[PDB]
Amino acid sequence: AIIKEFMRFKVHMEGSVNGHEFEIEGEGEGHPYEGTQTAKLKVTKGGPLPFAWDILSPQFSKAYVKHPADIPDYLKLSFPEGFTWERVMNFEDGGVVTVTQDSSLQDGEFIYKVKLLGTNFPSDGPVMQKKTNGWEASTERMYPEDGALKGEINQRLKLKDGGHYDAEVKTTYKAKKPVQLPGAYNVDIKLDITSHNEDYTIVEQYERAEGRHST
């Protein structure tokens, strides 16, 4: 009863990419048990961004993942205290993005604080030149390890001609207090940018995430 059928959230991100410092403030809402959510993001410091929005989009919500009843919903269970996650994204051309995030529930609303550092993107690369057109649907392979929950993704960014820009993503999700971990399973994820102004200083995103068995 702690996680309602309809839940909102606030998100704040402090970040730097290739030395460009920035802040983003956002609000979101969705249906945590059917695995759907939207959010509207606002760059509030250091806008407009000299780099592609798409590397930030997956950092804005695992409480919103549809889970079949036979799989422990570890991250839903972690509330009200919540959980934290830590992520590295390794892109094909040497770009790296590391992220840390804290998730909590306060006054009926999810609170997300995000920290992001990105470096070593090539000046003539698609991220710094903003030639990316959003993510292909992906599959995160989840599994229990070291008492936490881990996720692995081979993620593809669409390139504006028919190619792709790839990234290897590795995340660790940790409940702030021990709750039941699941076995290995898969989460099909699709993230869409639904609206943005010209300089991507206001962005809206949609995401559907649904868990299923690996078998």
Residue numbers in the entry: 6 to 65, 69 to 223
What does the report in the manuscript say about this coordinate set?
To allow subsequent comparisons, the crystal structure of sfCherry (without a loop insertion) was determined at 2 Å resolution from the protein expressed in E. coli. The chromophore is formed from residues Met66-Tyr67-Gly68 and is buried in the middle of the central helix. Unlike mCherry, sfCherry crystallized as a symmetric dimer. The dimer interface includes the hydrophobic residues Val96, Val104 and Leu125 and the hydrophilic residues Asn23, Glu94, Thr106, Thr108, Thr127 and Asn128. Similar to the AB dimer interface found in the Dsred tetramer, the sequence Val104, Thr106, Thr108 is central to the dimer interface in the sfCherry structure, in which Thr106A forms a hydrogen bond to its counterpart Thr106B. A sequence alignment of sfCherry, mCherry and Dsred suggests that the R125L mutation in sfCherry is likely to contribute to the observed dimerization. A native polyacrylamide gel at ∼10 mg ml−1 protein concentration indicated that the protein is approximately 50% dimer and 50% monomer. A homology model obtained for the sfCherry sequence using SWISS-MODEL has an r.m.s.d. of 0.2 Å for the Cα atoms of residues 6–222 compared with the actual structure that we obtained for sfCherry in this study.
